[PDB]
Structures are given as C-alpha cells and as structure tokens.
C-alpha cells in the first residue's frame, strides 16, 4: 500500500 503513517 501507499505510505500512510504520517
């Protein structure tokens, strides 16, 4: 998945 933590 596309980076989603920030």
């Amino acid at each position: 998945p596309q980076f989603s933590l920030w």
Partner: single-chain antibody
Amino acid sequence: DILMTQTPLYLPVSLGDQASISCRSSQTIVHNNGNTYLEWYLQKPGQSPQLLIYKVSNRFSGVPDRFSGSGSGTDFTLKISRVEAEDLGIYYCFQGSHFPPTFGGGTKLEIKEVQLQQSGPELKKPGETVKISCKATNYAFTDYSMHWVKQAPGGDLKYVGWINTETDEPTFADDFKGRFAFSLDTSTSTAFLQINNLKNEDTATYFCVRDRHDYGEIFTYWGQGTTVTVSS
C-alpha cells in the same frame, strides 16, 4: 525535529564479546496507532544499510537471535550477545513514528526477491543537475510508495522524502524543500530523484528505499545507493 542521540560513537570490540548500543529520542515515539516504529540498521563496509530490528524488538527475517532490541519511552538499546565478523560495520537507530523520520548518528563497531537497482555514480561540477534513477524489480511498482534517504560523506543518514507511486504526489523533509524533485516512470517501473544546482553539501550517496509499513517495517529494502560527487 526528533533528535535520536546514539551512543557510543565508536565501539572497539573483540569477536566473542558482547556489545550494547543505545539510543535516546528527544521525544516519545509511540505512534497514535499504538505502534512504536523504532528500527535498528546495520551497514556493512561497502553495502547499503540493512534492517535488523523493527518496532523496537522484533528481529527482521533472517537476522540471528544474537541481536535483540529493547526499550520504551525515550530510551532504546540494541544488544549483540556475541560479536562475529559479519557484524562489523556501522549501526543506526531510527524512528519512523513522527514525520520527518530521523536517524541516530551511528555507531562504528570494529575489531580492536524485492530489488531496487540505482543508476551509477556521478561526478558533477556544482551548479549542474543530476537525475538519479531507481528501478524496482519483483513487486508491482505502483503498490508501494518510494522513499529517499541521503547518506553524507561522514555516514550520517538523513531522510529526503517519499513519492506516492499512484498519485505522483511527493513529500519532502524540511531540509530538502526547494532543489529536490521526485518523479516516476511506470513504463520502466522507475522512480527518480532530481537535484538542481549542485552544491558541495549535496555530495553523498542517495538511497531509494521500499517500506513494508503494513507489516510494521519502515525501511525494508534499500537500493545499492548512488554516489553523487560534486567536484567544484
């Protein structure tokens, strides 16, 4: 913004001995989702960093149990029960919980299918421009974002940013706002980092990196790196 203070800067050791390395964050690194994204990397001489421990204490696949990570709050530690020849190199702690992610300054330890292929070393005069490429192999390119990390001459690691491979939207760490640009070419499964007006402070090895954040890992696959030498 979050300082990772890593000690010691140097750790001379004899094989067979124990080694402990510590890292203190200037702020807590628990993520609002409950996870603590503290990772430890080992960079062997002449190689890219490799992930050893993620989420504080979990050993990356294939990493020997001689390595254990512990800690909480603002203090973390990597312990090596018995140092072996293949453990020599530079260790870095890293926090990926709060943007921008940050790396500890490194600890030099010394005796007393996914693949990312980058373009070659470039020797450039200042004021010029360079376009570094990173080709992804063995996973679907647009399924994961592409991250970029800068490793200065003295070895310190700095996060540059990431590009969403589906929306083509980039995000930069404050220190790289302006002369850096990310772009991509899906026909060649390639991500690029372009640097305008080459300056002395740009000399470094730039790494493209793939995360597996949905597995709890931040920097799992690193390219071999691309050295940009600005010979003024």
